[PDB]
Structure formats: C-alpha cells, structure tokens
C-alpha cells in the first residue's frame, strides 16, 4: 500500500479528485492504521472481500473509476496467488463489466487466463 499511496498522492500529482478506497478481508495492523490516518479525505479502508457482491456494492465498485488489484510479491506458490487475482478480476467484471481493471500478475504464463475471461 505505501508505494502506491506515495506515487498516487505525490504532491507533484497536483489536482486529482480520486479517493482510494481499500477493500481487504484482513483488518489493518497498527502501521496500516497510522498510514490510513495520514490521509483523511483521501483514503478510506473497508473490511470485506471482492468475492462477495454486497462488499462490491458497499465500495461502490460500479461507480468506481477503476479497480487496482495488488498481488503479494512474496507467497508460497506464485500460481495460486495469480489464480486468486484472476478470481477477483472475474468477480468484479461479473458485477460490472464496463470497468477498467489494472492488476498484478506474479507469473507471465498466468496472464493468459485474463484474456480467456470474456469481459
């Protein structure tokens, strides 16, 4: 979260009316609570998955300009995480198809599954 927030909320970014809303099942740790309490009108956290339609509605995904999916770089299996991110893409594109999704893929071979998704 820190690197993305720093580049997105960089002062040189000047005037951008974009509010980053984070949806994650795990509750934020104290360092995350400090980092979220460094940005008030700019960053909101919500607890929930993107594999539940109600949580997507709560984060207002349909009205959201874009959804960015971040993959843990370090994981026991790269393919498993990649398939989880592809699952999240499938859930969001099944909720609201007319959306931009920028995602991270740990493996180059796993990228083809996104092309297989129709939306």
């Amino acid at each position: 979260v820190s690197n993305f927030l720093k580049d997105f909320l960089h002062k040189d970014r000047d005037d951008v009316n974009v509010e980053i809303v984070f949806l994650h099942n795990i509750s934020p740790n104290l360092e995350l609570e400090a980092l979220f309490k460094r940005h008030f009108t700019q960053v909101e956290f919500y607890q929930g998955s993107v594999l539940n339609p109600h949580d997507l509605a709560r984060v207002k995904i349909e009205s959201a300009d874009a959804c960015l999916i971040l993959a843990n770089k370090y994981c026991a299996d790269p393919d498993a995480e990649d398939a989880s991110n592809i699952m999240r893409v499938i859930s969001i594109k099944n909720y609201h198809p007319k959306i931009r999704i920028i995602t991270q893929m740990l493996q180059y071979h796993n990228k083809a599954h996104l092309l297989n998704i129709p939306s």
Binding site: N25, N52, I90, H113, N116
Partner: protein
C-alpha cells in the same frame, strides 16, 4: 406397493390412498376425486451382474502420452479434469465410474473415461478403478490447453471438472479457484473442422455465491438465487450445497434418499454393499440366467424430438400426448423437457445452452428442438 411420484401439493399425494374406478371413472379435474364413494467362459460382469467388469490390468496399460492420445481419435467420450496432488485428499472416482458403467448399457454404448490430471494423484486412487473395461489416463494439467487439445475436447461427450484440492481454511469463497478458471479456459478455445463455447462441461463448485462466474453473457443480478441463475439451471454447474439440502428432505421423508440412491448409483443392492464391505474391490463373477436378469433396470437418457419417432409430435405436440405414446410403445417414462434457452424468442440465435423443465402440464407446448428426459428400458 409404495409409489414415488413428483407432485406439487399435498392434496395430490392424499388422493392416491383413495381412488375408486367405479366412482372416479369420468373425470375432468382434481375435484372429481373425493374421499368416499365406495367400500465362452469370458469374464464380463461382476459377481452381482450389476456392473461391467474387466480384468485387473496394469496402470501402464491404460496410461497414454499426449501424442499417443493424438494418434487415437476417441470421440463421444467423457473426460474428467482432476486437480490432485500427493498430499491432497482422495475423492473416490469409483463413485463416478461405477454408475457410468452400470451394466445397463451395451459394451459399444459405454463411454470412454479419460482422466486428465496428475498421475501422482491417480496412482493412489486407481487401485479401486482397475476393474473397468475402458478407461484412460492422460497425465498432465487441465490448465494445460495442449492436453485438452490432444484429448479431442471439442468432439467429446462431456467434460467434468472436479475440485480435489479441498484444504482451504481461509477465504472459502476463493476455494474452487482452479475450477471456474479451468472451465473458462475450456470455453475460450477455438478449433478447426469452431469456438468451444458449445462444449458440454460440468464443474463442481463449493459456493453458492460463486456459481455465476461460469456462464455470463447476460447480467441477471449480482445477488441471484442459486436456482435462478443460468449455469445452475442449464445443468453446467453442480453446486455441492445440494447435498446439505438433501438432509432436510431426508428428515421429512425417509425415502427421498433411497429413491435418489437407487436412481443415481444405478443399482445399490445391500448384497453389493456387503461384497464391497469385505474387500473394497468389485470382484468379478460368471454369467448365469439369474445374473443377466439382474441387469433389467432402466437407465437415464435424452431423446431428440427431430430425428425421433415422436418427431411428428415434435412440432406443437402436447407434452401429455408424447408421454402417453412413449410409455405405451417404448415403455419410456417421459421425465422432463430439456428446452433450449432462446427457443421462445423469434430471432434465430447461436446459443446452444439449454435449461431444464421438470414435469410439464398438458397446455405446455413443444418445439422440435428439445431433448426431453426419459427412462429407457433395456432391450
């Protein structure tokens, strides 16, 4: 005799206690039925004669490589996409192959099961499947599109996707991740004499909020009910919550489970349970006239109206007329109509997905492009 039937009300099931032909002969409605009114020693089948049996062979005799399967055209067959490891738990594919080879089909009628998955999983399980007449193993990955390419997935009969890696403690909505992904991998494939959206697949899913990821071209509702969604109603998506739904029906009637278990396993006699119970191996037997009389059960099949003898009743035919003619002539219980999705529309479409209609009435019409379920007897 206790009769099992598909009703829609308790007043239906009440009026099979009482039925007087001398009182209820002339009839037009359910209001006519009132309470009162009157006062070559070749090993072929198993020991029970209930399943097709083979010689216990070696696993290398049923193994095949990719190009070896490419040498063998084997259309009209079933493939099973399995996702197993050494560490992952067994499913039991014996419960898949046995009702699919239930001695109720002829030996040319049997479908050739080709498993696709890790051989390190199938070696552990194959010691219960090694008595069956035609089964192949393609050691690979269902995500590997080359393996599905050299198994003739486009002109198979049905693909089956199973979730063996059932070990997730966290994030259980993400548990069946390599099932819907493998199904989408199958559905987005092209071929040369088409696009493989017409491939009959059934994928085991574990979550009700997860089943609408499979077939989407039309947004129904993000919170659609499980029975109302498209992939469930088309039959291309077997949820596993059906089993926990079975326990309530087993609580209210003790015979739903018995009916379904005899319908689905294809013969579940307790002598078979006892013979499996002592060695966990479907041993073979000789053929007697008592043995061949045991395979007199009826099977489950579909019927194309267009090429069928009922083709004349195919266009605009009343469902009741079709049911009566079939039961009287071929002794086939007309069982439900498997109607195409865009059939009620007027615009000719390319959607080959069909949905399920169970027990239709007399006023229900009939287009010729249907695949009505039936219970064919054994000639």
């Amino acid at each position: 005799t206790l009769g099992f039937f598909i009703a829609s009300d308790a007043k239906e099931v009440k009026r099979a206690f009482f039925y007087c032909k001398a009182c209820h002969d002339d009839i037009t409605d359910p209001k006519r039925i009132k309470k009162c009114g009157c006062k070559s020693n070749v090993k072929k089948y198993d020991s029970t004669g209930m399943f097709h049996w083979c010689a216990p062979k070696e696993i290398e005799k049923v193994i095949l490589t990719r190009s070896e399967a490419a040498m063998t055209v084997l259309s009209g067959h079933v493939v099973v996409c399995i996702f197993g490891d050494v560490s992952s738990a067994l499913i039991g594919l014996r419960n898949l192959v046995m009702p699919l080879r239930a001695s109720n089909f002829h030996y040319h009628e049997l479908k050739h099961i080709v498993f696709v998955g890790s051989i390190e999983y199938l070696k552990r399980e194959w010691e219960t499947l090694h008595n069956f007449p035609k089964v192949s193993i393609l050691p690979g990955t269902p995500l590997s599109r080359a393996d599905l390419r050299a198994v003739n997935i486009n002109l198979c009969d049905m693909c089956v996707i199973l979730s063996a890696n059932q070990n997730n403690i966290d994030d259980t909505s993400l548990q069946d991740k390599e099932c819907i992904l493998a199904s989408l991998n199958i559905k987005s494939m092209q071929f040369d004499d088409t696009t493989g959206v017409n491939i009959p697949i059934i994928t085991e899913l574990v979550n009700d909020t997860n089943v609408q990821f499979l077939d989407q071209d039309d947004d129904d509702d993000p919170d659609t009910e499980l029975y109302l969604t498209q992939p469930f109603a088309c039959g291309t998506a077997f949820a596993v919550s059906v089993l926990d739904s079975l326990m309530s029906a087993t609580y209210f009637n003790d015979n739903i489970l018995t009916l379904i278990r005899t319908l689905v396993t294809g013969g579940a006699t307790p002598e078979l349970e006892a013979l499996i119970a002592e060695e966990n191996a479907l041993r073979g037997g000789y053929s007697t006239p008592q043995t061949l009389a045991n395979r007199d059960r009826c099977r489950v099949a579909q019927l194309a109206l267009l090429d069928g003898p009922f083709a004349d009743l195919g266009d605009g035919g009343c469902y009741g007329d079709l049911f009566c003619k079939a039961l009287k002539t071929y002794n086939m219980l007309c069982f439900g109509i498997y109607r195409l999705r865009d059939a009620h529309l007027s615009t000719p479409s390319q959607c080959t997905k069909r949905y399920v209609i169970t027990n239709p009435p007399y006023e229900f019409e009939l287009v010729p492009t249907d695949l009505i379920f039936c219970l064919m007897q054994f000639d």
